[PDB]
Swiss-Prot record, chains A, B:
Keywords from the UniProt entry: Acetylation, Dioxygenase, Disulfide bond, Endoplasmic reticulum, Fatty acid biosynthesis, Fatty acid metabolism, Glycoprotein, Heme, Iron, Lipid biosynthesis, Lipid metabolism, Membrane, Metal-binding, Microsome, Nucleus, Oxidoreductase, Peroxidase, Prostaglandin biosynthesis, Prostaglandin metabolism, S-nitrosylation, Signal
Reactions the enzyme catalyzes: (5Z,8Z,11Z,14Z)-eicosatetraenoate + AH2 + 2 O2 = prostaglandin H2 + A + H2O; (5Z,8Z,11Z,14Z)-eicosatetraenoate + 2 O2 = prostaglandin G2; prostaglandin G2 + AH2 = prostaglandin H2 + A + H2O; (5Z,8Z,11Z,14Z,17Z)-eicosapentaenoate + 2 O2 = prostaglandin G3
Name recorded for this polypeptide: Prostaglandin G/H synthase 2
High-level lineage: Eukaryota, Metazoa, Chordata, Craniata, Vertebrata
Annotated binding of substrate, by residue: R89, Y324
Organism of this sequence: Mus musculus (Mouse)
Family: Belongs to the prostaglandin G/H synthase family.
Amino acid sequence: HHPCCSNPCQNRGECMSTGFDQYKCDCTRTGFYGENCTTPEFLTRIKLLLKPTPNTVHYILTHFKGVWNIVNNIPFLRSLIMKYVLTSRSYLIDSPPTYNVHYGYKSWEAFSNLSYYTRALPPVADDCPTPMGVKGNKELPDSKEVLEKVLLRREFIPDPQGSNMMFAFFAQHFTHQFFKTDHKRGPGFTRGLGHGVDLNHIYGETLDRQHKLRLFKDGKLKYQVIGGEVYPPTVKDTQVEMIYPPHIPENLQFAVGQEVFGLVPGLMMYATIWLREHNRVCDILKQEHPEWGDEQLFQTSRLILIGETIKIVIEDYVQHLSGYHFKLKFDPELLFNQQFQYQNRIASEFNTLYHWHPLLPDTFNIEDQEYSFKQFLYNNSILLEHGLTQFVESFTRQIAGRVAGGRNVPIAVQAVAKASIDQSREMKYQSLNEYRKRFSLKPYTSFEELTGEKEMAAELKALYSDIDVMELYPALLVEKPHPDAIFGETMVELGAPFSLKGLMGNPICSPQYWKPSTFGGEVGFKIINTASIQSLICNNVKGCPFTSFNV
Amino acid sequence: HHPCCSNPCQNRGECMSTGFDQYKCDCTRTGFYGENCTTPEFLTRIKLLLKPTPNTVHYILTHFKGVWNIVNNIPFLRSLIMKYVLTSRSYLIDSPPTYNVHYGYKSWEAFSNLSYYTRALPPVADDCPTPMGVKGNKELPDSKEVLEKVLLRREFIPDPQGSNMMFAFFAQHFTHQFFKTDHKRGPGFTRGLGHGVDLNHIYGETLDRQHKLRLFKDGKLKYQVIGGEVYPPTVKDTQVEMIYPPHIPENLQFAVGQEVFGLVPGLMMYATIWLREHNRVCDILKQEHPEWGDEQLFQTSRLILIGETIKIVIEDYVQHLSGYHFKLKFDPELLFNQQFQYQNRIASEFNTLYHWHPLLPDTFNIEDQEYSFKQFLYNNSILLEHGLTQFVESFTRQIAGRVAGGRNVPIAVQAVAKASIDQSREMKYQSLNEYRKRFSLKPYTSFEELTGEKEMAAELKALYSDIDVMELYPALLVEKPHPDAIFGETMVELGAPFSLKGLMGNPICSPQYWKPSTFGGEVGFKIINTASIQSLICNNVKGCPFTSFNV
Ligand code: COH
Ligand code: COH
Ligand SMILES: *[C@@H]1O[C@H](CO)[C@@H](O[C@@H]2O[C@H](CO)[C@@H](O[C@H]3O[C@H](CO)[C@@H](O)[C@H](O)[C@@H]3O)[C@H](O)[C@H]2NC(C)=O)[C@H](O)[C@H]1NC(C)=O
Ligand SMILES: *[C@@H]1O[C@H](CO)[C@@H](O[C@@H]2O[C@H](CO)[C@@H](O[C@H]3O[C@H](CO)[C@@H](O)[C@H](O)[C@@H]3O)[C@H](O)[C@H]2NC(C)=O)[C@H](O)[C@H]1NC(C)=O
Ligand SMILES: *[C@@H]1O[C@H](CO)[C@@H](O[C@H]2O[C@H](CO)[C@@H](O)[C@H](O)[C@H]2NC(C)=O)[C@H](O)[C@H]1NC(C)=O
Ligand SMILES: *[C@H]1O[C@@H](CO)[C@@H](O[C@@H]2O[C@H](CO)[C@@H](O)[C@H](O)[C@H]2NC(C)=O)[C@H](O)[C@H]1NC(C)=O
Ligand SMILES: CCCCC/C=C\C/C=C\C/C=C\C/C=C\CCCC(=O)OC[C@@H](O)CO
Ligand SMILES: CCCCC/C=C\C/C=C\C/C=C\C/C=C\CCCC(=O)OC[C@@H](O)CO
Ligand SMILES: CCCCCCCCO[C@@H]1O[C@H](CO)[C@@H](O)[C@H](O)[C@H]1O
Ligand SMILES: *[C@@H]1O[C@H](CO)[C@@H](O)[C@H](O)[C@H]1NC(C)=O
Ligand SMILES: *[C@@H]1O[C@H](CO)[C@@H](O)[C@H](O)[C@H]1NC(C)=O
């Protein structure tokens, strides 16, 4: 078998076979040497005794609300801290990207082929003696058993951080521009070739789709007016392909950038809001530039919207997730004297860790009604009937489920949770502990340490035998959450760097783009710099209902 | 008409219309302010007063051989000098890229559509009152008149810098991996979607093409053996599309990565050499790694050859072109503590300036035959008849033509030169002086200053009237050359930043790729770091003939 199956190289060292039965570790720039890159260089010894634990940094940012209220009001200090928040993560992500599902070594194929999700850790080799390498049993536990024992929801567990349905649907809508698995090819492949925040979920992935969605007047996107309300146009009107079941009538087949957004009325809500936003921004640009044509209005509105999106994601969305008392800041300028790559490639593991189906409630509560999954799925009538204003009011009110802590996957999506496990396996993911080490965390020494509890730990011990072969995805869902938090440590430490990279990596954040001229002058620039989840709703939803990501 | 037609914003200010008849310049990070970005900031006045002119720097690098002799043999200094050389040429290229033929403002479409060449300067707006903006006559001069008066060769002018046919054909072979105009779409479109040094001219642009070219045994490329000599495989064996006239015999229809390489036996000489190199490297890696399969042998040899190419281009090819006494060095480590983007997008103007058709001789002198263009085109027989050894010996001793200095484009390719002019105009290129300002040079004040001579200057003055509307492409070919040099200032000052960006931008130069494990261990890494034009020929051409880029 492959001599690297046991994952012998530590500290970001690279493993390579050197004959049938031997390996060598490449310890270049790891700050370690020795056979397995485990012997620290002198500067590394000094860096390691002085480096705070990820859990210490977390504690500082989630306590001392009094000190943070001061820090948050000294612009120079707020800049300084946000600068640290951005750069301390940066070094963890390979950019240019490296591995993928087919390439556990660097290759031009893995670098150049945009159809692959990239990989933060190389796949376990095909001929390893155990699924994870060398440790554990010949087979992993039945995924149905892992699912039923520790993942599935008994009683609904609300998120103690107060995440609402505005948040859950925003997560779903936002991330589905860059997580668009190409099932024809396999779970390690993506249809999102832009690999980030390009808003293809609004504008379409291909130019042909964009052109069918565009009005070609005033930069605007096509729309329809129903009962005086602006909604997306239909499939028959646009000829834009969407996924709908057969029983869905022509008039309820709304056409948006992303093929799957008819699935959920929560997604259609956001699609409608962003469509209105784009056309609202067109109206403003046209007022500033009576001389501009359709094409420039469209393109400039897209860049503004991309900027709005990143702004909202950092300052409301990540802000809410973080539980930080520190006020996060979207400011591209903070990277201008730093080493940073303005490019991104979506990692398979980022897709995997974002399968937050425990956010989903048992029923969807709009106004006085309590819709089941059966009733809610593919039902855009519900949207037309209640309207965006009520959708916003209801979803702002409705609490979402806790993601970590175990046993919170709604039964309605059990098949999806099973697939995340099976497809992790099919893609040959390395173990939870391997991922933890890759992200500068201590491997868990037992199942009780992972869960912080006894009962689930015991189930997991019986299923997996060895903590070092525990799988990444179920571990994220059963991990001991931070105190009163939605997630545990592994989710935060893997998610945050993938997030920073995808947000700041965007070309609009580079010095040649980050200028008022890029966005049609100072007014367009200000739309980006003052954007928020509240203003997005206020500007585009009748009556300007109040909103946020917490209940 | 568009209020930016006159190009009012200086110093890399960005121009934007604010009404029908008004503009605003965006002076962000230019170091200037005021209406047209022409007033310098205090620190800018200083930076201006100190900073040496590009010509003064060229003089220092092409003189004082005694000093350079010391520096070159003192590694720490060589390295510090190369680091300057690399980082000064850097800030000149927009990266992430910006404009293209259809987008004179920044847009997601220009960012993301890899099918365009990018643009260093945006195009002249469609409705401008003159071809170059507002200066000059309503029509630029007949392009045949320009071609015939100042471009066409009367008498062959040899390169006083000593460039040979080995150099001339290396330039053509190498550049044709990234200059691959998609004539079906237009001159501003490329088929080279990798946008750099990916070796698609050897391996194929598509996976479909690569796979038909591969042996699938030991990592190797398919080949044939004719008279005991290894040549590329045929079109019939591989089913790889090549451009060939109907009349060419089955066996001389060589199939290589780049579809046009059967055009010229000079091109097929290098194609064959590089094919041999790839399979030679396979052999070395197979020896190192008996455990490796076909796929990893192939991909690893590919990365090795990419490195080989960059190394040769920097240390042999650019070295020769530069006329420097200083010894350029390929060493990715020199950028590791610098700010640099590991990405490239091929610029249209880089394609344009690289039309070095004056390099071409009047006949192709092999052994004691002197082949006309008519005889040499598409004649792979010549290659088989003489063999690679004679090709190398003959092309090493044959002088190439001077590029700058005027009147040296061979009549045989007059149509290509005319097309360079017409296509510049079709892509709405700004004038020579706009390009010189864009690359930190003073605009020429007269035609005589451009040519350094009287007679062509007068023909040009009569044709164009204003130096400020002189065109880029013809200017490059008529420019006063540097002393005893093949090129003039504008060629060097534009070409150099485009070059080093595309060389160092490659992902193999990034910290996560620049490691021995990437190339199969120390042995593969060493193939790269010891590569030379002489070693390429020595390892792959029978009899190991002497070669170099100069006669
Ligand atoms: C971010 C949180 C989030 C939420 C709130 C959410 C809400 C919901 C929801 C009710 C609104 C339903 C019925 C589903 C149902 C599904 N989800 Co999600 N999903 C979420 C994150 C994801 C992600 C990420 C994927 C992977 C998408 C991909 O790779 O294409 C996913 C995949 C799926 C799949 C497999 C899709 C396929 O292409 O086969 C189904 C089915 N689901 N989900
Ligand atoms: C770098 C030096 C160089 C040399 C030595 C060279 C040598 C020769 C040569 C010698 C046997 C011949 C017969 C030609 C003939 C042509 N070359 Co060049 N070319 C060169 C640089 C270029 C470049 C750059 C282009 C543009 C390529 C593109 O845009 O695809 C080009 C394009 C062409 C074209 C038109 C575009 C096309 O259809 O491909 C013709 C015809 N040629 N060339
Ligand atoms: C990026 O990698 C993708 C996966 O390797 C690749 O898709 C694959 O493309 C190949 C070649 O075009 C397809 O192979 C086809 O042709 C062979 C032999 O001629 C047939 O036996 C196959 O049935 C098939 O029709 C594969 O279908 C395809 N593999 C997949 C999708 O898993 C992409 O082409 C690559 N992208 C780029 C830009 O190169
Ligand atoms: C890369 O940018 C390219 C330049 O615009 C683009 O090429 C263009 O593609 C469009 C749409 O696919 C073609 O226009 C079509 O318009 C109607 C459809 O209703 C048809 O009647 C036309 O025949 C045509 O299909 C343009 O012809 C085409 N322009 C060209 C070839 O120069 C690429 O598609 C863009 N690439 C990506 C990945 O978005
Ligand atoms: C190098 O790291 C590897 C870790 O896999 C070590 O490999 C061996 O060490 C084990 C216990 O120390 C032995 O039982 C085995 O022979 C072997 N393990 C495996 C998985 O085969 C090796 O000791 C390390 N060497 C150094 C320098 O620490
Ligand atoms: C910088 O920009 C140019 C704009 O082109 C200059 O305007 C020019 O002023 C000239 C002198 O009065 C006029 O001859 C001419 O009308 C005008 N050029 C054009 C094409 O309109 C601005 O004055 C200058 N601005 C400043 C403040 O220096
Ligand atoms: C591919 C495009 C990327 C966009 C993805 C956007 C958001 C994904 C959000 C979260 C992933 C999971 C967990 C991390 C979230 C919050 C914890 C702390 C956040 C933090 O420290 O700043 C995080 C800071 O680094 C971010 O800038
Ligand atoms: C797209 C991938 C990039 C590969 C391009 C490779 C080769 C092109 C070679 C030279 C640049 C093009 C035209 C001439 C410009 C400069 C050459 C002369 C002097 C020089 O380069 O030195 C200037 C000094 O700075 C040394 O660099
Ligand atoms: C191979 C060149 C054919 C061009 C002939 C038509 C254009 C003539 O052009 C003329 O050529 C003369 C001789 O070089 C020069 O002295 C003149 O300045 C030039 O205008
Ligand atoms: C569709 O949703 C609507 C709400 O407008 C609901 O009344 C109806 O029962 C749903 N239909 C189905 C088939 O679930
Ligand atoms: C083909 O090249 C060969 C060299 O072997 C030569 O003898 C012959 O004349 C050439 N054919 C043409 C069409 O010039």
